[PDB]
């Protein structure tokens, strides 16, 4: 048998103490009145007695919402410590007011203050009561703060320090405590959500709590925006500076729900389709024809803007959608000429080392110069960190570097080589060959840059954003695959490097896995890596596991290494990657619409500014506002509070 | 510390004003009576005073369902603005009646009217009360309306215009406001749901709200159909014209739930199996034998219908299931003869240019003529837009165009060529070769047309419909893949076009990737696209990345471009496609049964009509009804209202 007994026994109350506690619990006003009146004369009764659960008379009265008994007890000088916290958590306005007018076990940590707990409960009435009487919440220090106080409190008590920080941020992130007591509720919500996300990053533990608080702040900002009832109010909100300055701040803080709000998107769309009042209600073929006509006239529109900016034809390209169409058309002609650079239209003799540029390359040159100039302008104005946050800008940097290297190598080969030596006799590192290879890589990057234009489309945009979001998990899995690849490459090279044979002995003087008869698949480490990479796609033939000497044990061990690699990468790793992509794609498709709308908002905003109006190659040739904003914010806060009371009930 | 203070302070009430408001909230009739009676004599009390939350005495009384206090306040001439809206939203019939008999903060936008809000709440009693007293809801203008009023209101206030439109459509889409006040609730639900879906398309923002309203209308129509209790009522509903006219209107408006309703499907099945009373209760082998017997007798049934339509054998094919079996059997014999056209049964000498048709082709000719005639009849009767909404009809158009081109090219080659020149010496664009290629493509399309017959099957039908629904997301992903393909094709062609070699230099006088030893994989852009497409399926060998001159840097850059393309398309893009297909297939399989039943209903309805009874090749040889419908609709509305009251409680 397992004996059962109260292992940690607590001192029980007297019969009269339990009578007093049962009296206050029951609600009999007269019984408690008599009990504490008698207690006053003697030392008989301890008015501050505790139930097993640690609740005294006052806490029991609060738990039953018994204002009369509470008033009596407070009149008879009951110990009141922590009673206000229980009243606030119970969310009884009457009890809170009664307590405001006037070491035991406690259900609240010692750092919890009345205003902090009220903010946690998010009760507008009680928070307003506690704020009307001047209260303060200590400022949480910066996340990466190395001051004496932070390190001292962390080393003395890390658990209590983290708990206090999280409680303070829960109090600040309360929508009610921001509706009150915050001068700019929208900006406060933005900055608080951003700071909470950064805390979630740094505080690896308690990550979920900070993420929840950040999401709470984002939702509060979006709901405040929801309460707008006219376009005047929405414009006042979005244009406030402490145009579209508030919207730009929202983009900076990644407030995706706020930006993708339907009315904000409607205003952005009206700004974006500036020249077309009825673009929303046009037919698909009409839209297609208008886009084609604007695109074909991009040289005309750009030249008109250059010659006379202040004219009917000149300022047509300043409209954001027209500007986008013109830039897209210019980039499309650039890609078309990149395609032409390979077709044999007035092509130079291929035996000329360091040839002069063709007409196609002479036409590509202004586009390349324009791209380089535009990218340096963008990184000069926006800064490096904002530039690198965009993977497309990183690809632009790589593409322009490759184009510049192509120009440099072409110039070097032109000034260094004069003759027409046959191409078969050129050195491996001939500058013309390297220039052509770099130009082809640049062509790949330039044509791949077109994917970023999917963001402007309603059908391809969400899909492109979802794939971009999947890329990071794909990259992590590729890292683990590369570790496996290095392992098997090391093993196979170690096994096979003895049997390396010269190219002369090979059937076509060809050594490697790129010959008609593959050979020396695992002779060198670099070639072994190439062989395993190509075996991923089944382009490596099995007979590469044989050697001339026909060492059957060595060949079988090599074939088994190759087969284990194939099972690991193609049967295990590839299907694990498929499963991860499925899970991540479900999670992404949950928020795909919001994410795509945020990306398309960024794309639209990039075309609102006057700078960069001309696409390549043509680009190388207060108090009243604050009062209005405060009035609108007051209306929004009132509507939000009413709506939250409606939803809570 | 972070100071906390009421940033946007509101003017607080007096002690006596707060006493009045607490009196009306408490419910003390005498206190409020005395308070406002005293207020009448002086200017002491403002009866229209506002709480912080913006609720006056009347709103507080409404919120507590206090009819006596409301009556008192209304008697003492309290300002009543917006009180009716709060009463309606609270959904208290007594308060609404009391208020009907008789700029502050408001929880409702200015455009909300009492009837509109009542429709939003969908409360049958309150809506009926407000409708009995004549009320109107402004007509929302057409979606693509360019009138002066629409553009003026949109440009003055777009947010308010969109809000008003959405509120009006929410009011109209109320099931209670359609049960009342709508002459044809089913047709009104159909048209309103269709219009709301179109609004969801056009109004890109607020898409979810319009989709929800459209789904609400569809559900209301389906529930009204659910309330039918006899086959007479169901037939009256489905046959009403303002046969199966109501069902045809439902098909037109894509009311899939209404069509796939069990009783409607049961009636359709009885109409469909006209000749077989017990087809539902027959065995699988009996069904198979009956289908085979009807199919083998299709020439007999068709000829009987031709010779004598009004006879026992003649009108057997008029039955929808018999007609379907006969058409399927005719198409199956057409496909069988298409197979025979390749088998060597009395085959013409292959060296004859422009030969006369074989017996197989002479038998195929009537089928092709019948298909062309049937398709032109279908597009003549139904119109082009209804024809193109069906992808199968588009494939039929392509197939018949290819067949007609085959006939034309055969005739041209017959009249132009007389000799028997050997086939090896024919020109590349010899009309006989083109005719044969077009005929083979037509054979592919004709045999693929059989997939559309899966809709008639209970097991293969849902699957085929699900795949068809997945095709569109597949197409979008193919678009992004084609962009990637063009990028890498541009790069690889740019790198490799210098090393293009003539066909004479190749081992078999064969140039391209279709030789035994592949070569010139990336010499031209077209060939580069072909090479990358075939490398998708692993049919491109690695040695095509080599060149004669063995420029090791160029060959390595080409192999790396090829490998990056392989990783992007096969490891990244293909698995992204798999993930998208999984997600879309889950979403589709949620509604697969309804979708398949709608498709099979369309298939069945296509065989109900007398026109097109004969398959190829044989096809080339009021007030009383309205009263009954209104009676049935009255019964359905009563049953639906009772059922909704039952479900709400
Ligand atoms: C910031 C973005 C980074 C990417 C773009 C930056 C430009 C990078 C371009 C750099 C090329 C610059 C010219 C170098 C060669 C000059 C001539 C020469 O001496 O050849 C020498 C070898 O030459 C080589 O090895 C060149 C290899 C270049 C590979 C670049 C691939 C970039 C792919 C990116 C995807 C001869 O050596 P030797 O004396 O015979 O011994
Ligand atoms: C609406 C549905 C669209 C599809 C069906 C419509 C029918 C389309 C059929 C059209 C063919 C009509 C005959 C054209 C050739 C006539 C003879 C001739 O001059 O040959 C010339 C070349 O000829 C060609 O290039 C023919 C190429 C036809 C490819 C059709 C593939 C359709 C695939 C669909 C999947 C000789 O040229 P030359 O003088 O040597 O220089
Ligand atoms: C040694 C010989 C070399 C031979 C030639 C090699 C050829 C290489 C071919 C290019 C390889 C990279 C291909 C990237 C294609 C673009 C990706 C499209 C999908 C996508 O949405 O990604 C977005 C941008 O990614 C990106 O743009 C990623 C760019 C990364 C920098 C490229 C440097 C190379 C996410 O972008 P976002 O929405 O997160 O912002
Ligand atoms: C230049 C040399 C050419 C060489 C020969 C080329 C051979 C091409 C072979 C045919 C390619 C198209 C194959 C389509 C097969 C039918 C699709 C079955 C799956 C399916 O349910 O799709 C339904 C109809 O699709 C469809 O019927 C799609 C038809 C699209 C038009 C076909 C024009 C070609 C959806 O139909 P739904 O239920 O949405 O209505
Ligand atoms: C991260 C790493 C996780 C990977 C853990 C899994 C390791 C499994 C290693 C398993 C790796 C097995 C490799 C076997 C192999 O290399 O075969 C060929 C060799 C040389 O010619 O000779 C044989 O030896 C002959 C027996 C073949 C026995 C095959 C049975 C193994 C089943 C493999 C899965 C195929 C399933 C496809 C469906
Ligand atoms: C939309 C675009 C999104 C795509 C973004 C991803 C790009 C990855 C590019 C990654 C593309 C890598 C291409 C590498 C390659 O072409 O290999 C062969 C070449 C020429 O012979 O020589 C080497 O260079 C030898 C090192 C091989 C190193 C392979 C490690 C890369 C891992 C690839 C994944 C295989 C995983 C299978 C499981
Ligand atoms: C698929 C193969 C043949 C390569 C084709 C390359 C280009 C001709 C395609 C690829 C991506 C396409 C772009 C994808 C995105 C858009 C957005 C599109 O705008 C919309 O979809 C909605 C209207 C709006 O932009 O406001 C305008 C066309 C454009 C630039 C497309 C123009 C044609 C592009 C450049
Ligand atoms: C699989 C290979 C051998 C190709 C076979 C081609 C045809 C012989 C098959 C392919 C699709 C089949 C059709 C798929 C759909 C149906 C529906 C089927 O009807 C039912 O399933 C339920 C009964 C009903 O139709 O009411 C009648 C047979 C039929 C025409 C099938 C007849 C035989 C078909 C034409
Ligand atoms: Zn600090
Ligand atoms: Zn209008």
């Amino acid at each position: 048998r397992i004996p059962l007994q109260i292992v940690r026994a607590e001192t029980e109350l007297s019969a009269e103490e339990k009578a007093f506690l049962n009296a206050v619990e029951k609600g009999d006003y007269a019984t408690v009145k008599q009990a504490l009146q008698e207690a006053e004369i003697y030392y008989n009764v301890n008015i501050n007695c505790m139930d097993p659960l640690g609740r005294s008379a006052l806490l029991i009265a609060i738990e039953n919402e018994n204002l009369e008994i509470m008033e009596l007890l407070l009149n008879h000088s009951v110990y009141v410590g922590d009673a206000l916290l229980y009243a606030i958590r119970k969310e009884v306005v009457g009890a809170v007011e009664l307590l405001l007018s006037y070491t035991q076990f406690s259900e609240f940590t010692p750092d919890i203050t009345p205003i902090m707990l009220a903010a946690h409960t998010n009760n507008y009435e009680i928070i307003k009561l506690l704020v009307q009487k001047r209260v303060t919440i200590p400022r949480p220090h910066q996340i990466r703060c190395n001051c004496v106080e932070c390190v001292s409190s962390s080393e003395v008590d890390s658990l209590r320090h983290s708990r206090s920080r999280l409680n303070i941020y829960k109090a600040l992130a309360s929508p009610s405590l921001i509706a009150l007591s915050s001068e700019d509720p929208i900006l406060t919500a933005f900055r608080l959500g951003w700071e909470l996300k950064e805390l979630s990053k740094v505080e690896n533990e308690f990550k979920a709590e900070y993420e929840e608080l950040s999401q709470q702040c984002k939702l509060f900002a979006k709901d405040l925006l929801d309460q707008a009832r006219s376009s005047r109010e929405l414009e006042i909100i979005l244009n406030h500076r402490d145009d579209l300055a508030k919207l730009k701040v929202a983009i900076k803080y990644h407030q995706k729900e706020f930006v993708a709000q339907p009315n904000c998107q409607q205003l952005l769309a009206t700004l974006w389709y500036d020249g077309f009042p009825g673009w929303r209600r046009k037919h698909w073929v009409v839209k297609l024809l208008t886009c084609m006509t604007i695109g074909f006239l991009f040289p005309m529109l750009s030249i008109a803007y250059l010659i006379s900016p202040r004219s009917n034809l000149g300022l047509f390209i300043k409209k954001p959608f027209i500007k986008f169409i013109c830039h897209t058309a210019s980039y499309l002609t650039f890609l078309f000429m990149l395609l032409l650079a390979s077709q044999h239209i007035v092509r130079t003799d291929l035996h000329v080392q360091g040839p002069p540029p063709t007409v196609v390359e002479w036409m590509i040159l202004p586009w390349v110069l324009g791209f380089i100039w535009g990218e340096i302008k963008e990184m000069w104005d926006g800064g490096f960190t904002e530039y690198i946050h965009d993977w497309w800008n990183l690809m632009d940097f790589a593409m322009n570097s490759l184009y510049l290297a192509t120009i440099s190598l072409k110039i070097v080969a032109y000034v260094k080589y004069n003759g027409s030596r046959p191409r078969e006799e050129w050195e491996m590192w001939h500058p013309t060959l390297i220039a052509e290879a770099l130009f082809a890589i640049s062509n790949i990057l330039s044509s791949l840059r077109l994917i970023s234009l999917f963001t402007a489309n309603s059908h391809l945009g969400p899909l492109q954003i979802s794939l971009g979001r999947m890329l990071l998990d794909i990259l992590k899995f590729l890292f683990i695959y590369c570790l496996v690849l290095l392992a098997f490459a090391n093993g196979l090279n170690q096994l096979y490097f003895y049997y390396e044979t010269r190219a002369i002995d090979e059937p076509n003087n060809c050594k490697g896995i790129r010959c008609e008869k593959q050979n020396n698949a695992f002779s060198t480490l670099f070639e072994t890596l190439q062989s395993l990479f190509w075996s991923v796609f089944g382009l490596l033939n099995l007979y590469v596991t044989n050697v001339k000497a026909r060492h059957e044990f060595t060949e079988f061990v090599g074939a088994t290494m190759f087969g284990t690699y194939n099972v690991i990468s193609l049967v295990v790793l590839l299907n694990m990657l498929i499963a991860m992509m499925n899970n991540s794609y479900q999670l992404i498709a949950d928020h795909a619409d919001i994410e795509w709308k945020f990306a398309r908002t960024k794309l639209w905003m990039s075309y609102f500014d006057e700078g960069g109006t001309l696409p390549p190659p043509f680009n190388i040739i207060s108090l009243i506002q604050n009062q209005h904003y405060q009035e609108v914010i007051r209306n929004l806060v009132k509507r939000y509070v009413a709506a939250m009371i409606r939803n809570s009930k």
Side-chain angles (χ1 to χ4, degrees), chain A residues 1-283 285-649:
Chain A
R1 298 190 167 188
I2 300 176
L4 300 179
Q5 57 170 8
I6 311 292
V7 281
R8 287 161 296 277
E10 56 193 330
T11 65
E12 291 194 17
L13 306 155
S14 299
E16 70 90 9
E17 289 275 47
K18 181 183 298 180
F20 174 34
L21 248 34
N22 191 13
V24 53
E25 158 61 40
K26 203 275 185 303
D28 274 9
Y29 175 86
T31 312
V32 179
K33 169 71 173 181
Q34 174 183 345
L36 41 69
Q37 188 63 58
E38 145 208 21
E40 164 73 351
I41 303 295
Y42 332 137
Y43 62 95
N44 171 33
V45 199
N46 194 22
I47 310 99
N48 323 338
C49 60
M50 279 310 179
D51 206 75
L53 302 170
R55 48 189 204 169
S56 65
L58 195 47
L59 303 187
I60 293 171
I62 292 178
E63 180 67 18
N64 292 322
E65 301 197 18
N66 201 325
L67 289 321
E68 302 92 357
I69 294 196
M70 283 184 56
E71 170 206 20
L72 178 106
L73 286 165
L74 289 174
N75 286 322
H76 296 92
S77 177
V78 180
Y79 170 72
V80 81
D82 291 335
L84 186 52
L85 299 183
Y86 291 89
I88 291 168
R89 189 183 58 181
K90 193 66 179 61
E91 300 192 26
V92 182
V93 174
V96 170
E97 278 161 342
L98 177 56
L99 283 173
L100 285 177
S101 60
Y102 306 106
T103 59
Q104 308 162 342
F105 161 81
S106 177
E107 295 198 35
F108 310 99
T109 61
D111 62 309
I112 289 291
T113 68
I115 176 61
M116 205 170 305
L117 183 55
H120 290 176
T121 66
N122 197 37
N123 188 267
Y124 180 81
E125 301 85 342
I126 298 190
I127 293 174
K128 190 173 183 176
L129 279 171
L130 284 181
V131 169
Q132 279 170 318
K133 322 192 177 190
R134 290 325 208 198
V135 294
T136 63
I137 292 185
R139 321 186 75 90
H141 293 209
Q142 199 264 326
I143 297 175
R144 297 167 174 84
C145 189
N146 302 277
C147 78
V148 159
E149 317 300 334
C150 270
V151 294
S152 179
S153 64
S154 176
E155 292 167 340
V156 166
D157 200 332
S158 296
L159 196 156
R160 200 185 302 275
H161 178 73
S162 171
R163 181 72 267 168
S164 301
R165 175 170 294 275
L166 187 54
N167 283 332
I168 289 175
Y169 276 108
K170 279 177 50 57
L172 293 182
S174 175
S176 300
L177 195 53
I178 302 181
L180 307 154
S181 78
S182 177
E183 287 291 346
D184 194 336
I186 296 177
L187 183 63
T188 289
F190 288 175
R191 289 191 283 195
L192 198 47
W194 179 254
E195 191 172 0
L196 289 164
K197 181 60 64 180
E198 302 307 317
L199 282 151
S200 155
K201 288 191 187 63
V202 164
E203 304 285 58
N204 311 281
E205 307 307 315
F206 318 100
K207 175 195 61 58
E209 292 80 345
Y210 283 115
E211 283 177 356
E212 179 178 10
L213 291 177
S214 173
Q215 210 58 48
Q216 171 176 314
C217 288
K218 297 176 176 297
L219 186 76
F220 169 67
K222 199 219 57 179
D223 298 331
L224 270 193
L225 194 62
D226 281 332
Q227 296 309 320
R229 296 179 180 177
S230 63
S231 288
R232 180 198 63 95
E233 296 177 355
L234 188 71
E235 278 139 16
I236 287 179
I237 296 153
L238 296 188
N239 295 327
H240 179 250
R241 314 201 161 177
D242 50 286
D243 274 331
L244 299 181
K246 190 76 61 186
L247 189 54
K248 292 182 182 182
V249 173
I251 297 173
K252 171 182 57 183
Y253 288 132
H254 292 85
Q255 306 293 323
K256 300 195 175 61
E257 300 85 344
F258 183 94
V259 167
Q261 207 263 335
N263 289 127
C264 176
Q265 287 295 305
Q266 177 189 29
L267 185 149
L268 280 173
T270 64
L271 284 179
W272 169 260
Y273 297 112
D274 187 14
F276 316 89
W279 181 272
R280 180 183 306 267
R281 297 172 170 178
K282 286 168 189 170
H283 194 268
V285 299
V286 181
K287 294 182 180 183
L288 200 67
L289 262 293
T290 308
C291 286
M292 300 312 177
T293 300
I294 299 302
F296 283 123
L297 294 181
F298 98 84
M300 187 207 65
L301 290 173
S302 296
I303 291 174
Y305 178 82
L306 248 184
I307 293 181
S308 54
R310 300 152 174 170
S311 61
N312 265 24
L313 200 65
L315 59 84
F316 199 62
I317 198 181
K318 301 184 67 62
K319 301 176 176 307
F321 183 56
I322 293 296
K323 183 185 308 177
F324 171 77
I325 296 296
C326 291
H327 282 234
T328 294
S330 168
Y331 199 81
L332 282 177
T333 65
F334 171 65
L335 294 181
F336 174 74
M337 293 177 316
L338 289 184
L339 286 175
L340 287 185
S342 185
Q343 320 305 315
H344 285 280
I345 293 168
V346 63
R347 181 55 203 168
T348 53
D349 167 58
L350 56 92
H351 300 296
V352 176
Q353 10 180 26
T358 70
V359 297
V360 176
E361 283 166 353
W362 279 124
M363 294 173 62
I364 291 174
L365 194 56
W367 262 270
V368 171
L369 299 174
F371 289 143
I372 296 175
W373 168 249
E375 293 303 308
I376 70 177
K377 280 189 309 181
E378 189 172 355
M379 73 183 63
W380 166 272
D381 280 358
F384 280 87
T385 174
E386 197 174 13
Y387 186 88
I388 297 193
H389 182 266
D390 204 329
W391 288 15
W392 292 118
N393 292 17
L394 172 73
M395 183 198 254
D396 289 332
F397 178 72
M399 171 202 319
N400 293 154
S401 302
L402 283 168
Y403 274 133
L404 209 51
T406 300
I407 298 173
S408 303
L409 284 169
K410 271 178 170 55
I411 295 175
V412 165
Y414 179 82
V415 305
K416 178 180 175 180
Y417 299 89
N418 296 329
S420 195
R421 182 161 58 115
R423 201 177 197 87
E424 308 81 59
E425 315 171 8
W426 291 5
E427 188 235 340
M428 189 211 300
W429 302 108
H430 196 287
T432 295
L433 298 175
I434 309 182
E436 294 164 352
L438 296 188
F439 189 69
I441 305 173
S442 317
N443 287 17
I444 296 184
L445 293 183
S446 302
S447 308
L448 283 171
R449 193 53 162 86
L450 265 191
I451 299 284
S452 58
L453 296 196
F454 284 161
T455 310
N457 181 259
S458 282
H459 310 280
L460 313 171
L463 186 44
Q464 178 236 337
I465 301 306
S466 303
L467 309 188
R469 291 170 70 194
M470 269 189 289
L471 276 186
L472 259 194
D473 291 356
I474 301 174
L475 257 56
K476 293 201 297 294
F477 202 84
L478 292 187
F479 189 88
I480 129 93
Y481 161 79
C482 282
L483 203 160
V484 170
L485 170 70
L486 184 68
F488 277 91
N490 183 27
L492 274 162
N493 184 24
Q494 187 71 38
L495 180 66
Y496 278 98
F497 79 95
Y498 305 93
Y499 316 95
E500 180 173 3
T501 66
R502 293 173 302 160
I504 306 96
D505 316 327
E506 298 305 326
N508 217 79
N509 262 252
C510 180
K511 173 182 179 177
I513 58 170
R514 294 199 303 266
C515 318
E516 187 178 6
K517 174 181 174 53
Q518 298 173 341
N519 54 84
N520 293 273
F522 319 102
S523 296
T524 65
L525 179 58
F526 187 59
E527 175 78 346
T528 309
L529 289 160
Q530 293 172 266
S531 298
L532 298 187
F533 166 82
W534 286 116
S535 75
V536 156
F537 308 97
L539 296 191
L540 188 67
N541 299 118
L542 192 55
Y543 59 79
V544 312
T545 53
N546 272 10
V547 298
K548 283 184 181 178
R550 290 306 306 271
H551 293 136
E552 291 227 337
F553 172 67
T554 294
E555 291 173 341
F556 178 78
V557 168
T560 308
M561 293 180 176
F562 188 53
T564 308
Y565 171 77
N566 276 258
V567 174
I568 287 177
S569 64
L570 293 177
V571 180
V572 180
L573 283 184
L574 193 62
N575 294 337
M576 285 173 165
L577 179 65
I578 293 178
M580 294 167 48
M581 289 208 203
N582 302 342
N583 184 85
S584 66
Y585 179 79
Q586 297 179 58
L587 303 185
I588 285 163
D590 287 330
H591 296 73
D593 184 61
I594 294 283
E595 299 283 342
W596 163 68
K597 272 158 184 174
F598 190 75
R600 190 188 61 175
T601 291
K602 291 163 68 175
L603 188 146
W604 289 2
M605 298 289 282
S606 64
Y607 289 96
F608 285 179
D609 291 350
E610 179 180 5
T613 297
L614 293 174
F618 300 101
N619 61 331
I620 57 176
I621 298 177
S622 174
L623 184 61
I624 305 302
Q625 300 171 342
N626 255 282
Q627 284 171 351
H628 294 343
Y629 181 77
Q630 283 303 297
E631 181 182 10
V632 173
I633 278 298
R634 195 184 318 261
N635 291 328
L636 294 180
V637 165
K638 294 193 62 176
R639 298 164 191 171
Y640 174 83
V641 171
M644 288 308 112
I645 289 180
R646 182 71 187 182
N647 287 28
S648 72
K649 298 183 189 177

